[PDB]
Design a protein around this ligand. Sequence first.
Ligand SMILES: CCCCCCCCCCCCC/C=C/[C@@H](O)[C@H](CO)NC(=O)CCCCCCCCCCCCCCC
Ligand SMILES: CS(=O)(=O)Nc1ccc(C(=O)NCc2ccc(Cl)cc2Cl)cc1
Ligand SMILES: CS(=O)(=O)Nc1ccc(C(=O)NCc2ccc(Cl)cc2Cl)cc1
Ligand SMILES: CCCCCCCCCCCCCCCC
Ligand SMILES: [K+]
Ligand SMILES: [K+]
Ligand SMILES: [K+]
Ligand SMILES: [K+]
Ligand SMILES: [K+]
Ligand SMILES: [K+]
Lengths: 282, 276
Amino acid sequence: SDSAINVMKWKTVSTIFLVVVLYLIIGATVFKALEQPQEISQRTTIVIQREKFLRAHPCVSDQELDELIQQIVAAINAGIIPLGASSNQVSHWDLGSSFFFAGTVITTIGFGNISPRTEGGKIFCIIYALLGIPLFGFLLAGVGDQLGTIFGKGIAKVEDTFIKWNVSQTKIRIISTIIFILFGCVLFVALPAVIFKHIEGWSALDAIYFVVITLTTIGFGDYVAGGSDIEYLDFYKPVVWFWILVGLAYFAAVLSMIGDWLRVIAKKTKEAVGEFRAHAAE
Amino acid sequence: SDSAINVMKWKTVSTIFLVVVLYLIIGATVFKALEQPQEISQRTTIVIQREKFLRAHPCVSDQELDELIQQIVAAINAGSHWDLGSSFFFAGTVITTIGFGNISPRTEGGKIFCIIYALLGIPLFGFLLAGVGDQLGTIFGKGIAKVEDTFIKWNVSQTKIRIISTIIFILFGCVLFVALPAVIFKHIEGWSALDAIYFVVITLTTIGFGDYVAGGSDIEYLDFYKPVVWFWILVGLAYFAAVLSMIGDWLRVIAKKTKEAVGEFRAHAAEWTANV
Ligand SMILES: CCCCCCCCCCCCC/C=C/[C@@H](O)[C@H](CO)NC(=O)CCCCCCCCCCCCCCC
Ligand SMILES: CS(=O)(=O)Nc1ccc(C(=O)NCc2ccc(Cl)cc2Cl)cc1
Ligand SMILES: CS(=O)(=O)Nc1ccc(C(=O)NCc2ccc(Cl)cc2Cl)cc1
Ligand SMILES: CCCCCCCCCCCCCCCC
Ligand SMILES: [K+]
Ligand SMILES: [K+]
Ligand SMILES: [K+]
Ligand SMILES: [K+]
Ligand SMILES: [K+]
Ligand SMILES: [K+]
């Protein structure tokens, strides 16, 4: 009965797929409901800024105007400060920023603000990730273990003081998982999001949004710690490397937990549908 | 002794940590070696274009140009991008963690929902991706049973056919998931052969710089293209999922052979030295 279970497996893969299709649909509508308006109010006002110099300088080709912008945007992807008051310019591929870049590869964050333009940079980048991603896999795992055992020692002390009359074995894990979410979200989310707000100038929401986008390895790149030129004590960046190293370890378990809650809510809903069928109006 | 086992673990972590830092150092110099130049040649040519525009058109004064370039910088911070299809795309880049970032929420509430969507989305997609890979891995099992019967009744027997089989998984695998889609991307997107492959790997590894996006350029796409890319991503992520894991296990073997080759080398220092 080898196919007995494979027939059953495909039945579970297909329902998870139809539920993933439905999760993309619900989200797809909620984002354009949130973002479609601001996009329009920003295209009407940007055309208002277009005309105020479209006919403010008729002695330009006015086709090269929309062609000029192409030369800027197309050239901004690499990072360009085309200004006359700032002809001197800081590098994006210097000693520290190309060390950053390597980090954003092996950790699959890939912010993208700085990416290779040379065919060699690309070819090396493909080799670098195909090796470096697995390699960094072991480090993050060891950093998960260590960080994990440092918590086993802490709960061995918290699960002995709260041992009062009428204690249970399986219920006390509920108390455990709560302290993991609470203390975790402080050191890896709350505390570092504050330093971001003050060092990068970001808002409270923007710093948290950066933390989540970064430590889930989505890494859009719209916000990046250490991106601007401000001052960067350089006590700053090396601490961020460590935050990433341990902050990734954290979300790895957190995300993995959230999934278990999803099998369970999946079990209790699969059986609640059996109950409902089973009674269904008397 | 519990603290003795933990001392063995921290010794292991600390060495893998050093290898990672030493890997980051190498990469940093090789990228700085490859990208520093093009940055300077493109910084010199963009300064030539900036006066080349003030000279060819005396129409624009120097003071106006700076105002112009400030507005374009703002346009970068906005860009339709949030239509019925792009927002579905976006949702794709979130739950897969690829996150190209060519489209990203600007609303305060779209950022909050993106946090919620991602925390619940990423785990959900993992199950999907876990079954896909499961299926895909059994489909390839029905293929190696067929292959590990026609070759294993004859020429040199087991203990080296397991290495031939994994080359089959890598040879075809690259064809269906890397090569074939890069060919389609080349013609449909206008990307060079390298740029397409570059894209394939930076996407299917969830890196997703967003410097190349399949479907992001303004062009007429057949009705059937974007849906096939989804399926590609779906099945392609599963493939690099294992591929990245194999590479991970190859490093596990090699790292042992180098740890013991260092014991040998020391060790023939050892008894070659005791020879006085
Ligand atoms: C593309 C960027 C270049 C990557 C360069 C990193 C190579 C690392 C240098 C090799 C030796 C590592 C230090 C030795 C540590 C040993 O005491 C220890 C056993 O005691 N071995 C390991 O921990 C296990 C460590 C084994 C891990 C080896 C990493 C595999 C890299 C292979 C790339 C080949 C390219 C050839 C260029 C030289
Ligand atoms: C705009 S720039 O690219 O030109 N300048 C820089 C930007 C960032 C950094 C840096 O080290 N940030 C901390 C860090 C480290 C590793 C990883 Cl994986 C992620 C992060 Cl956030 C340095 C220079
Ligand atoms: C400025 S835009 O936002 O309008 N550009 C777009 C670009 C691409 C697509 C799209 O669907 N691509 C296929 C695809 C699907 C899922 C995943 Cl995860 C990744 C990918 Cl590449 C839509 C819009
Ligand atoms: C934040 C977005 C929430 C999206 C959650 C979708 C819920 C879908 C529930 C589907 C239940 C199917 C039950 C099938 C059991 C046999
Ligand atoms: K970007
Ligand atoms: K990314
Ligand atoms: K991942
Ligand atoms: K990513
Ligand atoms: K990722
Ligand atoms: K990106």
